[PDB]
Amino acid sequence: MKHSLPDLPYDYGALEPHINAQIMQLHHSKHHAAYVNNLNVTEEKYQEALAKGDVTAQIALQPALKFNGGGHINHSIFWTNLSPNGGGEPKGELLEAIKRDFGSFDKFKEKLTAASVGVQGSGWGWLGFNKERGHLQIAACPNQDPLQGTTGLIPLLGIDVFEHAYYLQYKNVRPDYLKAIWNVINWENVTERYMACKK
Amino acid sequence: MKHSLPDLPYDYGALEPHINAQIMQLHHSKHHAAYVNNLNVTEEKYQEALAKGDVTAQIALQPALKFNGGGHINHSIFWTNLSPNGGGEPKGELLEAIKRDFGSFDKFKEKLTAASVGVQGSGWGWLGFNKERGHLQIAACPNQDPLQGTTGLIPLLGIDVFEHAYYLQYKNVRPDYLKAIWNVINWENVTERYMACKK
Amino acid sequence: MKHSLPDLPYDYGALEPHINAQIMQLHHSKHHAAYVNNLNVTEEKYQEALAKGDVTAQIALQPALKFNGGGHINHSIFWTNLSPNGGGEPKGELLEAIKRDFGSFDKFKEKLTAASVGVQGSGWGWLGFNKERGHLQIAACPNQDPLQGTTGLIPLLGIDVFEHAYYLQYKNVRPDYLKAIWNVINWENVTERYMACKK
Amino acid sequence: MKHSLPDLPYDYGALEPHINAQIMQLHHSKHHAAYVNNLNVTEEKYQEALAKGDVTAQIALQPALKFNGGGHINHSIFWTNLSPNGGGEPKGELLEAIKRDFGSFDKFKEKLTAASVGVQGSGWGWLGFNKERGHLQIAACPNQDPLQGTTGLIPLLGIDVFEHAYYLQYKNVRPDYLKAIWNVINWENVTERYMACKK
Ligand SMILES: [K+]
Ligand SMILES: [K+]
Ligand SMILES: [Mn+2]
Ligand SMILES: [Mn+2]
Ligand SMILES: [Mn+2]
Ligand SMILES: [Mn+2]
């Protein structure tokens, strides 16, 4: 069973002017394509090392597995977290959870923006669900370290703050990118992920 | 005593076509300027925390100090490591050390390229001098972690592989950037740093 | 400011049989004494580095500062978290918060035990207060990384799971140490720290 | 492949008085046994995750795999690095390499001691062989991070500085443990590992 690059759910220019078409095409067709391919190569090497009991080889593969596997995990969620139909505020139970856990939607936006801008180097800001506590939680992750695999939190909304996610359009001004991306957040998808967490 | 942003030793377009003028101007006047300012802010906070014996505050400042202080250290070296008069091969004792420690100049280039391309996320590749062993050594550093402060090796030549160092021109293809940068390496400066290591 | 080794709030054997006297004496008079001594030396080197603008030296000193400074922070709290008059359950608002945030006192004990037993290598388990969220939160920290300095959470109760905290008595069986330590938790002190977090 | 706890090449008391029998028995029959048991369980979970394409599970298993897998790697080498017939100095080409790369045997001992005493928290000191450079190299590793899997260096001689390696006998005084262990270094084994590195 081989991982595959999911198609983007919209056209490359569908998020303009907030994220331009050149970024979207590079981010999906170059960056994510590389994560998927490198992940499949690493998984095959890991299976061979596992069959031989070569623990040294398994451990040597860990950085590539986490970076490319995390890349596949994170970007697969990210594309569904964005939409030309996005923006605005969520509704229903997700909005009530946001108000309850963060005070208000705007306070939530400030907290997730702060986590995202606060990443030094490459990384991600996340809104997650803490299954044990039964409430929302914000965390930042370094590089491609994925949220569920490294924290146990269920990913609801992720913000990529690798420079390749914004640099062509916003250059060094990452806060301008964070300002723009709220306009294309697919709250329908974040709600779907949130409702799946509760039963 | 306040750290200051050093002027670039050449014009913004002096490294074209290998690194374009837009990158050089952003890299120096935006990125490095921010490292210097954030470093001075962090040092002042650290002095206040030290005077109060607030160890919690000192430790909370460590990520900003290492990232921005390392940024200042690394980029101050980087600008002198590049030159419109660069390229080619070093001469004299540095060239002999390279041949002795790495086999050949081309083998050295392969090793430093591999360390630089191998950085997952943001970071730097370095040629350093090991004072204890009295020979050259290649290392990679994550994010802005500076070479001497984190490994003890004396920096001779650094390659910035943060995406902001290349993305506008080379997009995702970091190996194309590594290929181009050999044309502007200031071997006169790397030789100066190397000869200072020996006495 | 010259940090000092705090006097223990009880004699070394006051926590027997749950933590034996030899451990308490070594832990305070050798391990914590070393954190304090190393912290003072490192702080003096940082004052010198700041006066010279030596950023390389500041960064090279960071691991010693975090390990010994964190050691001083963590153990100063730890001694006050324990008492010969301790054990049992908290009362009042802290007990209500524990039931609310973790389900029950017994479930809280399972969660903090699991976090503490789960540390691979040296580290700490913590019950903290999240000031932003206004509720309790459990976290683990590697090595001596202090809770507030690295996470912002306010420490309420810490469990040292460095091997020196238990090995002489419990050897490799860290779970037996975790079970025993509940008998000497100073819930009066933890309640004080919790009430200080609220207006 | 089901990993197994290797038999010790000697009885638990064979390294006395330098490492006492209680430590050796605990270290092998409890600590290393646990690495093996935890490694086999984790490998089975990784086989299941690979079959399902569960990348989140693969990444969540990485800390346990590196800690217990590294533990298995490191301790399997460690037992062979020690002997009741050990101590003294190596001879032949290994001794020549030590004098060449470190100045003298005594200077090498100082460097490996300093690296081992310098580990903050749990970890290992190593003498390794750098295959690319064709010479000896000293490195420290955090926790159970194995030398070859994380650095590419081939392990020749390892010094465990987890507290369980020395605490029962030497308490906090890790330098006394480092001085004593030179009396039981199996230089015959280290020489074998060194000669295997060369054509
Ligand atoms: K009691
Ligand atoms: K002997
Ligand atoms: Mn990305
Ligand atoms: Mn840069
Ligand atoms: Mn301790
Ligand atoms: Mn061990």
Residue numbers in the entry:
A (entry chain A), B (entry chain A), C (entry chain B), D (entry chain B): 0 to 198
What do the authors report?
Human manganese superoxide dismutase (MnSOD) is a crucial oxidoreductase that maintains the vitality of mitochondria by converting superoxide (O2●−) to molecular oxygen (O2) and hydrogen peroxide (H2O2) with proton-coupled electron transfers (PCETs). Human MnSOD has evolved to be highly product inhibited to limit the formation of H2O2, a freely diffusible oxidant and signaling molecule. The Mn ion is bound by inner-sphere residues His26, His74, His163, Asp159, and a solvent molecule denoted as WAT1. The hydrogen bond network extends from WAT1 to outer-sphere residues Gln143, Tyr34, another solvent molecule denoted as WAT2, His30, and Tyr166 from the neighboring subunit.
Of particular interest is the Trp161Phe variant that decreases k2 by more than two orders of magnitude compared to wildtype, leading to exclusive use of the product-inhibited pathway as k2 « k3. The reduction of amino acid size at position 161 from tryptophan to phenylalanine leads to a slight lengthening of the distance between WAT1 and Gln143. From the cryocooled neutron structure of Trp161Phe Mn2+SOD, it is apparent that the Gln143-WAT1 hydrogen bonding interaction is perturbed compared to wildtype Mn2+SOD and may be the primary cause of the observed kinetic effects. The bulky Trp161 residue likely constrains Gln143 and WAT1 to form a SSHB for proton transfers. For the Trp161Phe reduced resting state, both chains have the same structure, and WAT1 is forming a hydrogen bond with the amide anion form of Gln143. For Trp161Phe Mn2+SOD, the protonation states of Tyr34, His30, and Tyr166 resemble those of the wildtype Mn2+SOD though there are notable structural features. Tyr34 engages in a 1.6 Å SSHB with WAT2 where Oη(Tyr34) acts as a hydrogen bond acceptor. Besides Tyr34, the other notable structural feature is the hydroxyl proton of Tyr166 that points away from His30. It is unclear whether the orientation of the proton has catalytic significance, is somehow related to the Trp161Phe variant, or is a consequence of cryocooling.
